[PDB]
Amino acid sequence: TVINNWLLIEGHTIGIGDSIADSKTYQDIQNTIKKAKQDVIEVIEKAH
Amino acid sequence: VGIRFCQECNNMLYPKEDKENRILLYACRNCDYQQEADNSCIYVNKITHEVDELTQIIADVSQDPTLPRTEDHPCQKCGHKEAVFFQSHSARAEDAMRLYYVCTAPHCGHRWTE
Numbered sequence A: 001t002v003i004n005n006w007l008l009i010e011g012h013t014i015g016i017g018d019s020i021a022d023s024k025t026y027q028d029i030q031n032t033i034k035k036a037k038q039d040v041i042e043v044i045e046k047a048h
Numbered sequence B: 001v002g003i004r005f006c007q008e009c010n011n012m013l014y015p016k017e018d019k020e021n022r023i024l025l026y027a028c029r030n031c032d033y034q035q036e037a038d039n040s041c042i043y044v045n046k047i048t049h050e051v052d053e054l055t056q057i058i059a060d061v062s063q064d065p066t067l068p069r070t071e072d073h074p075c076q077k078c079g080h081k082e083a084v085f086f087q088s089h090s091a092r093a094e095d096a097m098r099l100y101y102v103c104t105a106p107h108c109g110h111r112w113t114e
């Protein structure tokens, strides 16, 4: 009861602003993905 | 190795022993046709059996639109650049990822494996 009636003051939500990252993070993620795909390609070449 | 057939009944020739001249004779069970063989080996069993598919690869696979193509591997015979390639495409192969190549130039059909 106490926490609910206090939460009536602070509030809570979830949204796109909470699910969106920053440009630097997007660059990091894309770099990591490209490196991983390149490494998989290298492994396939060595196997062939 | 192979199967050889009698010329009279056209049945399989089983090996029969000639206990007089110490020689091998192929004889059938339908008529009394005899023969002398050149293999001199009744039975052969290889358990490795790592057959190179270059005998079993058809040259007609070059017309497949779903196969990858490369131009960094020119054909040994006709020097054509583009050459289809694929993997072993064999079941009962314990482990294999080697590539196989077929030249895409018509009537060349060169099938190698670097």
Ligand SMILES: [Zn+2]
Residues within 6 Å of the ligand: B006, B007, B008, B009, B010, B011, B028, B029, B030, B031, B032, B033
């Ligand atoms: Zn016969």
Ligand SMILES: [Zn+2]
Residues within 6 Å of the ligand: B075, B076, B077, B078, B079, B080, B103, B104, B105, B108, B109, B110
């Ligand atoms: Zn060729």
